[PDB]
Symmetry: D2
Subunit: 357 residues, 4 copies
């Protein structure tokens, strides 16, 4: 209604193509990104039609060729290694010695259940896992890690940090809270702390392609792919001084799935973090392929996940909304689907390159 | 038509919310992301209504508060430092000594005009700027850099690499082209080569906020902001082992503008690269604020830029399509608008945090 | 005797300057590095004459000027944040799922006392602190961390890894031990895992210089130094894409002390890791200066620590040999002396630069 | 004489072992490090007895086993890729736009011969190669690169920076020189700018070991070594978030040679930067092994190179003093000897690990 009057305000230059009617509502319209399907992606038993919101189009095709090569090869096996969202306030004291005392306090086992109880009023779903106090001079970067059910859970983890931050004025009234975020989290930035430590769902996803299928179907060899993986994704990314960028195009696939399933597209910068491994097995006859992804940040609940169209795309994958089984399970399964689509993407583009030789 | 029949194929589980009718066309539908406006953004003289495709909504508001604080403070001044898209094939020889000879050849000035002529049949718009051969053992990572007009120009730079790669079999028939990309570019990955060297448009954007406006309007002080910038964006990102992540949330703003203007959302991982500087000036009375962004990768031509809705959003900014003035100027101006919206974003969220103390 | 005959073998070109007589003994001689003294370094109460083995000479002077400025300013306060040496074997399995099972096993609390008992036959002094299994495809990088008394303790931690690696063939006979080191430790290399996680003694060291002393003695101001620290050591090292290099010259001081006290000079690459913080305190009247150093790797026992000359230099500092008080205390105190000399070094050179303006 | 009286001052606690007599002279004594020989190292035709100053002793043995395996395998071939020492002042202006104008000025070709003439009064040997102005907000980090003959040449490059910095007050009187170093050089710190760009001598060194020698002599296989190189030195260093640390122990060998030849042992942090490549050649029959080292910083002239003992060690290698042939050639040849000894070190320890399986 108003958003309709606000559009004519702006043209009084033309924003004519931008549709207004079609979406249920400071909005001035909406853009449209077409959705392609990659599948079947055979993953931990189940088949998935992977929705990919993208303009490219040759990317849906490329991810498709990868899902097929894995479909006839046994499919993919994902393993969730760690599941927990993080927020890291920077606080400070008058001294590093004093700041150290907050560290040793927070990192004492015997204090945990108290810090936990305080943190977990943040919601029904907040369950604090750990606290890592990093000291730099008289400043402390306190990394809180917690499970958050099927929500990506950034407000939740913040309600909880503030709970423990208020509770801490009892013992530490000299503490100055400089920021609710000190970039030690690290949110929507590439950071070693996320690579080393994990942020959100840390996933590994693997498949074995048989020599016969690498020749007949990918029109390359086991040895050519193992070598191209070492020279491009490992030695190449190393020579370029990459952080977490030891892969061919995880970012294309992660972005496309994120935008279709209504994730935060800015969290794609650390969610795209990936090492691609390609290892000759069975006296060089077959290839073991994996993606290891320490910081896939997704939810099936909240944000853009509950818009009509994005909701339809989660529902296709059967992860729409909170888990009935147990809270967190739909968000965990979404992460493995991303790791699986990434693995297919790596295999397709890595074969295309190696085959082109 | 077919895409309509393909949707029912998939439900034979429900993808009901996903709209089908509304977009002109393997598409199975399209998703809808609402567009907010941040402005006026006063930048290098002109005012802009900045389209931001996002679900958050508090992000459009936050970027708005920043554009206003800069509107009453003189507005922002952008400077384009470097403009050129890169592709880096990995080739190899039997020896490092032999690979060195390709390096010293390519990097000889007197060879450039020949390599240029060969490269520039890629299109009317391809103009090769440089070639940087990095040797690792007997492998060479040859970074080609070229201007590409108003197209982001990744196909163009590839047509050109292949031109020079074929031409090189004259002098180097022993060369094996292992990959058209060796991850030394580095495309859709965070890499030191992009931070150090630049990729696409390298922009700096700056404003001065007066003490009076920092107190009256941002409800903080000059000293509080300079300090929070050092502890969060500099010392914080350092303690976290960040690469290019010396900022608060460039990624939120870059993503939102990228998705609205039909850019490649996976290029957000290196386009979000940013150092935020906040420096007390005029005997501590005022604050100089900047973003330095070495790798903003955008075009106003091709890909998703020519869909109805994304086109309407570029046209709002007056950068839609190729430059009349001269090829490249619309893509350059789009980059500065991104740097300007990022600066507003940094100022808003950095003030909100500092003010909260 | 033989080493004397072996020298003439080599000249049959002249190695005449290289002394032979003077050292008690495949040695062919010995080189001589002159030792300077920086002090008094007033640190956690005590005064130290800091031995610095260096050719420069202007470096001993520069470190001296820093120790004096801190002597009249109250001296330095060190805090040991973490103390533990690490070794990280790479092992592998046929699958990532299988490799995950070693991770979840090792990282189960209830298994720790068993892994501990097995590990701690390595010596009287080996006390295992933790095990962090990082999975990459079907490979596992198992980071063992342990206290090792006053020895730097790299053989000790290795005897212990092999203990747990043999013990693991019970439950994991399918495990292949690919290497006793998989570069995830990371020994004598700069690595994010050491910055984020710590390796050996993690130290913070701090002093307050009064406005009066910054003007009268360092011939600069509080504001000039805070600013130069932000532009050089923080924004500068960031623009350069530094890892752990957020300081002016920790490496000069660490090297000089390491070579004099008979440490391993190749461990200087991660022992020099340092963030220098300089913060205005007391309404801008005074400056809080610190070094935070996550990976100082030293011992007072074994290796070159027990040569005549290197031993004399440890004995000057009163840390020579194993701790009577309790095992580890001399190696811990040596680390704080290094952090203190580094802080003096930073203050001296950072003042010299700022004063030169 | 005085240094003799200064020793008794300090004991009035015992520094008895530290020798006083034996060295020609604020010195209070000297320490002694024993020198071992690794060789013959067969490199670019010539044989070398490589002096290694180290306490370990098992390290000289390990480097010896590598030199022998290469002696019977054809020896090593080094290639110098780039030769130039760098200093990077941070200067600033009132604006980024203004700072940009210094960048575009300095980086204009037509200005170079003038900047060169000004720079090159620094000495007979200073020959300026390039200037790279990096802008961050209103600050500029100007990387000067120059040849410096056989001196490591850090004073020389500084005399030259100051020459151009004074000359710049003509055109840029508004410039503030904040520091003669802004950590963008980056001296005695690990930095992406050194990895990407090079600092001092950038060397590649390669050898081919035949299947027969890998079995008979190194007691492993071609395939085992290629694999261990990928899992340890590449995937391992990547998982650890390494910068320039894509090798097993370059730092051990670089340190040992640096200390014996009187180099600056603090420059070992960036001189140890290394990617180790191991590639199966000749239908998997043989192994191509290399080290690529972008920042070996050495001189044969000045500093500790002209002490009796360190001089004797350079003279063994035939690189002592300035080049007769042409200035720089002895310092260049020393770098290749370091790269060669590193390659031998990698081969020995990498074989020992792989063979242990
Ligand atoms: O390679 C990288 O470092 C990442 C890459 O840039 C991301 C980009 O979206 C992918 C581009 C791409 C694709 C896209 C379908 C995803 N398909 C191909 C099929 C056959 C042969 C090459 C390609 C290339 C392709 C074409 C030219 C290249 F130089 C590289 C890849
Ligand atoms: O801070 C960072 O490292 C990046 C951040 O995570 C990205 C995130 O999209 C921003 C979250 C955010 C916002 C969003 C409008 C963009 N607005 C605020 C307004 C007042 C106070 C805090 C915030 C926070 C906010 C709330 C809680 C926090 F912990 C941090 C920021
Ligand atoms: O600055 C850095 O990034 C690290 C530096 O390179 C390490 C080097 O050993 C130090 C060089 C140095 C020294 C040495 C005594 C340690 N003293 C000075 C005193 C007054 C003014 C400058 C200096 C400089 C000095 C001279 C010229 C410079 F460009 C920088 C520092
Ligand atoms: O591996 C790394 O990441 C680097 C390493 O730490 C540096 C260290 O100076 C080397 C230690 C070393 C050596 C030294 C002679 C240099 N020799 C061996 C011979 C046979 C088998 C193992 C080793 C190990 C050795 C022993 C135990 C290990 F865990 C690793 C290497």
């Amino acid at each position: 209604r108003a958003a309709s009057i606000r559009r004519e305000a702006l043209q009084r230059r033309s924003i004519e193509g931008l549709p207004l009617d079609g979406f249920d509502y400071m909005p001035v319209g909406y853009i449209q990104i077409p959705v392609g399907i990659a599948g079947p992606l055979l993953l931990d038993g189940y088949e998935y039609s992977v929705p990919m919101a993208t303009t490219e189009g040759c990317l849906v095709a490329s991810t498709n060729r990868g899902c097929k090569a894995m479909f006839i090869s046994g499919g993919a096996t994902s393993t969730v290694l760690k599941d927990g969202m993080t927020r890291a306030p920077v606080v400070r004291f008058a001294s590093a010695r004093r700041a150290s005392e907050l560290k040793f306090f927070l990192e004492n086992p015997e204090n945990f259940d108290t810090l936990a109880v305080v943190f977990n009023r943040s919601s029904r779903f907040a369950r604090l896992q750990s606290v890592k106090c990093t000291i730099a001079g008289k400043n402390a970067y306190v990394r809180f890690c917690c499970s958050t059910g099927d929500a990506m859970g950034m407000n939740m983890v913040s309600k909880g940090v503030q709970n423990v931050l208020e509770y801490l004025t009892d013992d530490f009234p000299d503490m100055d809270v400089i920021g609710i975020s000190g970039n030690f989290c690290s949110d929507k930035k590439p950071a070693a702390v996320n690579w080393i430590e994990g942020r959100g769902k840390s996933v590994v996803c693997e498949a074995v392609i048989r020599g016969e299928i690498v020749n007949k179907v990918l029109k390359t060899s086991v040895a050519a792919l193992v070598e191209l993986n070492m020279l491009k994704n490992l030695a190449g990314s190393a020579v370029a001084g990459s952080l977490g960028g030891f892969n061919a195009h995880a970012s294309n696939i992660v972005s496309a799935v994120f935008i279709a399933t209504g994730q935060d597209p800015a969290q794609n910068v650390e969610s795209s973090q990936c090492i691609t491994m390609m290892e000759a097995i069975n006296d060089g006859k077959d290839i073991h392929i994996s993606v290891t992804m320490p910081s896939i940040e997704v939810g099936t609940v909240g944000g853009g996940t509950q818009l009509a169209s994005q909701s339809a795309c989660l529902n296709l994958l059967g992860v729409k909304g909170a888990s009935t089984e147990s809270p967190g399970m739909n968000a965990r399964r979404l992460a493995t689907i991303v790791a699986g689509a990434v693995l297919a993407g790596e295999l397709s583009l890595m074969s295309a390159i190696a085959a082109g030789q």
